[PDB]
């Protein structure tokens, strides 16, 4: 789960996550929060684990 820019579409979020974190993502769901910030649920590839990607990001 990420807080992304309000102008970024699903394609931009998909490429940004791949470039910044060197992982492959399956799909991106997008909503805009009531406070105005866009939130992206970024599902990862089956061969990638979100648990240890969260460790290397530092949000565990």
């Amino acid at each position: 789960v990420f807080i992304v820019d309000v102008k970024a579409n699903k394609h931009q979020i998909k490429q940004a996550v791949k470039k910044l974190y060197d992982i492959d993502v399956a799909k991106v769901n997008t909503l805009i929060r009531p406070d105005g910030e866009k939130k992206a649920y970024v599902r990862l590839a089956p061969d990638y684990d979100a648990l240890d990607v969260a460790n290397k990001i530092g949000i565990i």
Partner: protein, 354 residues
Amino acid sequence: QQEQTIAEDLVVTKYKMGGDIANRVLRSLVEASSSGVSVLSLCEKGDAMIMEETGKIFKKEKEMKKGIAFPTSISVNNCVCHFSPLKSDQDYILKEGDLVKIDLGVHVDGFIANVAHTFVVDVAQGTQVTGRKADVIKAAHLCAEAALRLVKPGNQNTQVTEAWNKVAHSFNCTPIEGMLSHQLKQHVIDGEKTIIQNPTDQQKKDHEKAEFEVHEVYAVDVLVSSGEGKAKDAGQRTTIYKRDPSKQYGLKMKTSRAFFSEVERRFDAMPFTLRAFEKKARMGVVECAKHELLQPFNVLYEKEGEFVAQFKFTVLLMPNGPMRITSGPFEPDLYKSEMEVQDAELKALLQSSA
């Protein structure tokens, strides 16, 4: 009313041998601590020695649990206490002339023997270590002897902290702000009978005015800094946690529920380390801490270049003189200070013993 105490001679004996184990593992730690070693390696081998020794002792009563009462914590010149790096975390390399501070705890029947010591590594045989770091360890050692001498039921708890402040001002040092020693009963390291050192207005009013009572266990703990007395955080992961059995909450995570169950099986009531688990443990610990099911033991830092020393040990209170079951290997022959004690009471207590 059903809680156990030192009234049993079998409790006396298991205190002594558990303290002897705690002393022999500090001795093996201080001998193994040479240049080029890793603090992570030292902590994992120290806890491995504790686990096998506790398993091999008291094998005739295995309904209870014997093991770690406090994880092996090794802090070096910048960390106050509660330090235990993980495998994924960065390591520290030990160099020449660095003073390191090791805390350790062993338990039987939930009753706990606790001990710490500060010592410089790679010290040449028979030589002298000087500097502003060589008097903070001496003042802390005099604090440990002060606690040993005057620990006796019939004294006010405030006499301890004023004595430590007096010897600190004599040595031009100060204690660590808001450090608490504790009274130790069965499966308890956070006893309500607590001793404060370096207080302020806010902590003094939160403290309790109490008098020491006969036939119990104490863990006198002194933390002396040669600097100013500032302890904060610089973004290091907190590893040591302790379960709080008074509170509970409905966990919403499967991994946090499994992690909490693992705490119940292994370290149910006493502090532990995340090293014993780690990929799922780091996730399962933050949500339990968020709902205050585990009390974090935060790592503390000071300004770079300052130096702190720890000295703590369990002391048994019996009316015919208190006794020591855990001791740290310190020698004043190779350690001297540039400033001496000028108080008559302080020089009297270090001379006299029970």
